[PDB]
Amino acid sequence: SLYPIAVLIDELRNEDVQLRLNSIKKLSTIALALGVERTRSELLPFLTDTIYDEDEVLLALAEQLGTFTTLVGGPEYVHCLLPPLESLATVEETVVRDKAVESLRAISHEHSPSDLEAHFVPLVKRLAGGDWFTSRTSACGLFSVCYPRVSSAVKAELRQYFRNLCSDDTPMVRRAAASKLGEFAKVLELDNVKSEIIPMFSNLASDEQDSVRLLAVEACVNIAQLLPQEDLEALVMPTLRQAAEDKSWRVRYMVADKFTELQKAVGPEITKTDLVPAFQNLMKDCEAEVRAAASHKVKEFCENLSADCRENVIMSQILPCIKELVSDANQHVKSALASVIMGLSPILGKDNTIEHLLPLFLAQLKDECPEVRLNIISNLDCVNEVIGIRQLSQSLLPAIVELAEDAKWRVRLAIIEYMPLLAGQLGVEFFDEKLNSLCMAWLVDHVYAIREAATSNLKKLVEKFGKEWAHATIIPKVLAMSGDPNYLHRMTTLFCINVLSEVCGQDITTKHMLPTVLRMAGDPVANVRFNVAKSLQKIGPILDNSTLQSEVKPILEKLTQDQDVDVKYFAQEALTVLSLA
């Protein structure tokens, strides 16, 4: 007892904190080795009376007590271990307060109901009566956890205590009270909330602090999801209205954020009544933040809106407002709306988009901003799916050539990914007339991602257009650029041959690409040497065994015999894959 206490104290007073952390980790072992009665009698009041300056070992002993409750003995002895937990809750650091209150969450979870009442309720009432706002925040979290197992009189007492700490003047306990009020109504009853909570909810909404309005309308969307429609329409509907048309753009931004959960809670009919006009007011507010938020949320608002008047309200109200935000010049809201309008385009369908959304789409594509351009080109695939290929290809063919060669490798990548559909739509002749040069420029482009994407793209073109046409046109291009001084373009040619050997049958591989690859096998650059080795590794199973054993084998044994360890290892790997020896 006394000697483990002595080694505990001489370990805890030191210079470093690692020994103190090890002391906290080993405290459970020391206490279990001592015994239950020993730790309850001596070690627990010791850890109450010790005041530590260092928050991490404070946090560690908080979670250590949370794990230590079973070694103390469980629900019979949680009353014994509660006073250290409350003395630990009354501190100055938010993170160790969070650890303390979650340890109390666990304690109240495993606590027996009668003992939980008879001891925990005086403890939480003392914590509420504590003068420190930290103690009030911890208490108001304990009010949220302490509801179900106590009797109805205790429920009423804790309810009026909660109302009192909500009526407390200092704002941080008001924020914590609004958070625990949002958490609190999950366990409360309908009559209880509509009698006590909703009036003090309206008081919190009528308060002056933007933060307490933030967490109060968080509690509002929580109680809106909890409550049925018929009473929230009577009570919290004007409160969320005045919160929405409140002056503070912070809460306007966040109710634009949580508007989708709000309309999900209230149902589509309430949206048809009044949520859409207030939504228009929010998105026509002068703030970039609320505009970005509403522009983000229009898609899920639309798809959570039922189809009885959906297209009607979109044509009459939503779409002129959307093109108004397009006319707005702010960069962020433009990019957000560019993503979300083609998110919601399949809801409108082919006819509505082809009447309205294609000119706006082409304007946003022919906008200067890289952000709107990258967004629109990254999720163009939605209007690809919902709009016919020929229609969109004809609508986009004026702007494809400029967008094909421009600033961002992202937009170039998306154009490369999407263009073979246009090539298959426009046939051999149009692609051969103007897109062939663009494909070659993409092959000789700067970025490696662009090069690999262009290689996959020409795979798609060769499998769409046939082997002999690519033999007529594409194969001379690659085999002619396979001699230039840049090893990067040599790597490009090797990747393209690795694809076109797989796709192009075997005869053109054996009589066209194979001599060029084996004549690039003697290049002085080691990088392209072992890349040719990897190329033969990829290409070998497509050949016949005669050609392999005739010409591939001397090249492979030379690429083993050469001095560099990397190309030698890769040649060994390719040789044992092809099993030529």
């Binding site: 912070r250 970039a288 933040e289 702010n330 960069q331 962020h332 809201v333």
Partner: peptide
């Protein structure tokens, strides 16, 4: 920077 994030 058109993002106040308050």
């Amino acid at each position: 920077y058109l993002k106040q994030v308050p």
